[PDB]
Design an enzyme around this catalytic site. Structure first.
Site, PDB file in Angstrom:
ATOM      1  CG  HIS A 267      19.367  41.225  29.181  1.00  0.00           C
ATOM      2  ND1 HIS A 267      19.325  42.045  28.074  1.00  0.00           N
ATOM      3  CD2 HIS A 267      19.748  42.016  30.213  1.00  0.00           C
ATOM      4  CE1 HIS A 267      19.667  43.273  28.419  1.00  0.00           C
ATOM      5  NE2 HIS A 267      19.928  43.281  29.712  1.00  0.00           N
TER       6      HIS A 267
ATOM      7  CG  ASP B 228      22.454  39.206  21.992  1.00  0.00           C
ATOM      8  OD1 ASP B 228      23.442  39.921  22.259  1.00  0.00           O
ATOM      9  OD2 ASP B 228      21.414  39.197  22.684  1.00  0.00           O
TER      10      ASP B 228
ATOM     11  CG  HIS C 222      14.829  44.417  20.838  1.00  0.00           C
ATOM     12  ND1 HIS C 222      16.163  44.210  21.109  1.00  0.00           N
ATOM     13  CD2 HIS C 222      14.475  45.535  21.516  1.00  0.00           C
ATOM     14  CE1 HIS C 222      16.597  45.162  21.916  1.00  0.00           C
ATOM     15  NE2 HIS C 222      15.593  45.976  22.180  1.00  0.00           N
TER      16      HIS C 222
END
Ligand SMILES: CC(C)(COP(=O)(O)OP(=O)(O)OC[C@H]1O[C@@H](n2cnc3c(N)ncnc32)[C@H](O)[C@@H]1OP(=O)(O)O)[C@@H](O)C(=O)NCCC(=O)NCCS
Ligand SMILES: CC(C)(COP(=O)(O)OP(=O)(O)OC[C@H]1O[C@@H](n2cnc3c(N)ncnc32)[C@H](O)[C@@H]1OP(=O)(O)O)[C@@H](O)C(=O)NCCC(=O)NCCS
Lengths: 377, 377
Positions: A220, A319, A268
């Protein structure tokens, strides 16, 4: 036999008016507005107000919102005391988790979940959280707490309290963009954790504390810290030809891939064609590469993403460009996920309030596959 | 349009070998063994070992397990320090949440989730948690911490540290039964919250801290505290004919029901024909009614459940008989949910480890119903 829904993949858990995530078109709407557009011409404060109120603030509303924000930043005495009971070697997310837990515990209205109470708690939490992050990094560097400045906006103040010196206009701008991009994202693990906790009618702080725990994982929010750690494993260097970067990046990836390891910052659950926030975050990363004059970063960055596309046809997620951005800004790698919390507090609390307004306990079923019925001896 | 699964009702999220919950037969199996049978002839320690190891312990295994348990009860200096930074007026669940957060933060192996690390953390957490609960109640009563006693088992020690005097055999026995009944229960909100946090690959303590937040709500574990608060609202009294109790109980219920309020301690997401643990917990409640010589309790207790069955055909759940039991034992009402945590730590951690062993990120979808796409001004 019932249909088992591992990881609730493809399962629509509820309806939401907060944001729309579209894989097909790599799009993300925050209460109707495309995130790219909000990032291009809004402040995080406006986006925070938007997520909570379902509308962008007019001049007067924004003034009042900004006034409340800037006067609720100071780190509470007991919260700082709790942070000082934690080792300077523990994980920053565990510090954030503890800080928010203490904040909720000592809150005068911890048990009230009325729309007004939750909004006040949400805004006050958003305002004070950056003081937790800033102090946590400074204490690890053997430095002291830096008080908030009412003359600085959310982002400029965030950077100020952390480094003790005002950041460049381009830096606070790139930081503001990252806050907006990380603000909200439908039913991700941390947001869903917050909704499950809320579905029980537990308070806002209980929900956020659990969401922080979920955001911590490498699968995450923890992926932004992992991305940078990976760049640290592979040598950063300077001067090396693009061959060094790409050959070594692919090499690190080749070795990880052959060991059945996942490469953080790629993939994802929803986005199958690219992250809606990647182009914007990459643009911020580029602005920072230029600002701090460090093109060396791109060598490893470009090489690893090219190698991933080639080997697994998996594109990077938010990220990926975010980690290197915060690194250039001077943040310690362990602090990257807490920066995600700071922004995501807005989305988390908006969902918490939405959940409270149209509640149903979240409690699924499991299919037993353990020992068949036995008699106790 | 996709099928919306509000509250994930009827949705099988995964498979599990830990326990089987059957609505049709009001049954509950802990790794194959019926909970009624475990409660009738096992100690909580054996049940704790069972849930983690999938087998009841032999003599030698139980000895080693008990030795580790009794030597890991002491309240850590920093954890107590964190509790002392919280007001004696805050909610006990927020204290538990903070304590476990600090415990995880300062843990030497916070980042290791290997089966061995998680088991050690799970067992150490189970052992030390009762010190948090006991001290939390005593500090509110202006009293001091009472150290653990290695000559007392889990339940006897729990009661000892809380009250500073050893409890009667019948009392520790009824307490032991409640720990076993509360130990595990498939994918309930708190356990599922723990699995969602774990699905992200975040640590055990992060998962438990989030689960505690979920257990707090009145719709979940908070129902045991709510049940007793309700009995406090209605007069407890003594001498009043069963008419007082039943007329007043029904009256309180009638007024709550007409106001569209839910009566805590009744109903269940899975159990539609009665709770598998109710008959056992009621038997423990009866043992305590007899022990403390307080038949008055039953007046309000019987009257309210009779009235609920009559008006809504909804039977009581485990929290209904549990609340009055802990009340008779001398615990303050605000401490009832933390007592649930103490027991449920076993089930939570077993699921955390199970989740880690066969992981998949838990991230569902949402259906957008907010403002249609708009351009940012
Ligand atoms: C975010 C994420 C969980 C996506 O959810 P998902 O598609 O349900 O996850 P899965 O593990 O089932 O991924 C599907 C397949 O692609 C692979 N895959 C997904 N991301 C991968 C990555 N980042 N590195 C390598 N392989 C990856 C998986 O190993 C799996 O392979 P399979 O053909 O044997 O099933 C995943 O891409 C990931 O773990 N990314 C890294 C963590 C991250 O950056 N956080 C966001
Ligand atoms: C545990 C619980 C959430 C069950 O899940 P659920 O069946 O999906 O919950 P719902 O709110 O959809 O309950 C179904 C219906 O029965 C009613 N109901 C359930 N428990 C009730 C209670 N304890 N008091 C009064 N009405 C209740 C609901 O109001 C709803 O009415 P409807 O015909 O208008 O839909 C529920 O029984 C409850 O809230 N109990 C009190 C909290 C508790 O003791 N914790 C365990």
């Amino acid at each position: 036999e019932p249909t088992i829904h591992k990881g609730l993949a493809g399962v629509t858990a509820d309806v939401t008016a907060i944001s729309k995530v579209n894989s097909d078109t790599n799009s993300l709407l925050y209460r109707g507005y495309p995130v790219q557009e909000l990032a291009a011409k809004c402040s995080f404060e406006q986006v925070a107000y938007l997520l909570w109120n379902s509308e962008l603030p007019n001049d007067s509303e924004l003034k009042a919102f900004v006034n409340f924000e800037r006067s609720h930043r100071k780190l509470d005495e007991n919260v700082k005391g709790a942070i000082d009971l934690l080792s300077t070697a523990c994980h920053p997310m565990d510090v954030a988790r503890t800080a928010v837990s203490v904040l909720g515990a000592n809150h005068a209205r911890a048990q009230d979940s009325s729309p007004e109470a939750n909004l006040e708690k949400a805004m006050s939490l958003l305002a004070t959280f950056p003081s937790v992050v800033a102090y946590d990094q400074r204490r690890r560097r053997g430095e002291e707490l830096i008080e908030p400045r009412e003359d600085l906006d959310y982002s400029a103040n965030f950077l100020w309290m952390t480094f003790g010196e005002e950041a460049a206009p381009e830096v606070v701008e790139a930081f503001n963009v990252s806050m907006i991009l990380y603000a909200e994202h439908s039913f991700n693990a941390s947001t869903f954790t917050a909704r499950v906790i809320t579905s029980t009618l537990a308070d806002l702080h209980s929900a956020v504390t659990g969401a922080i725990g979920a955001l911590k994982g490498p699968l995450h929010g923890g992926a932004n810290e992992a991305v940078m750690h990976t760049f640290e494993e592979i040598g950063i260097r300077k001067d090396e030809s693009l061959d060094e970067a790409a050959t070594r990046s692919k090499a690190w990836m080749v070795d990880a891939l052959a060991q059945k390891k996942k490469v953080m910052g790629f993939g994802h659950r929803v986005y199958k064609n690219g992250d809606s926030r990647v182009p914007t975050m990459k643009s911020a990363l580029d602005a920072m590469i230029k600002h701090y004059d460090r093109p060396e970063m791109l060598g490893l960055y470009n090489g690893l993403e090219a190698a991933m596309e080639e080997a697994k046809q998996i594109k990077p997620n938010l990220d990926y460009p975010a980690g290197p951005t915060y690194n250039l800004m001077g943040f310690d790698t362990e602090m990257f996920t807490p920066l995600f919390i700071a922004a995501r507090i807005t989305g988390w609390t908006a969902h918490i309030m939405e959940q409270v307004a149209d509640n149903a306990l979240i409690r699924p079923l499991s299919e037993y596959n353990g020992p068949e019925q036995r008699q106790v001896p």
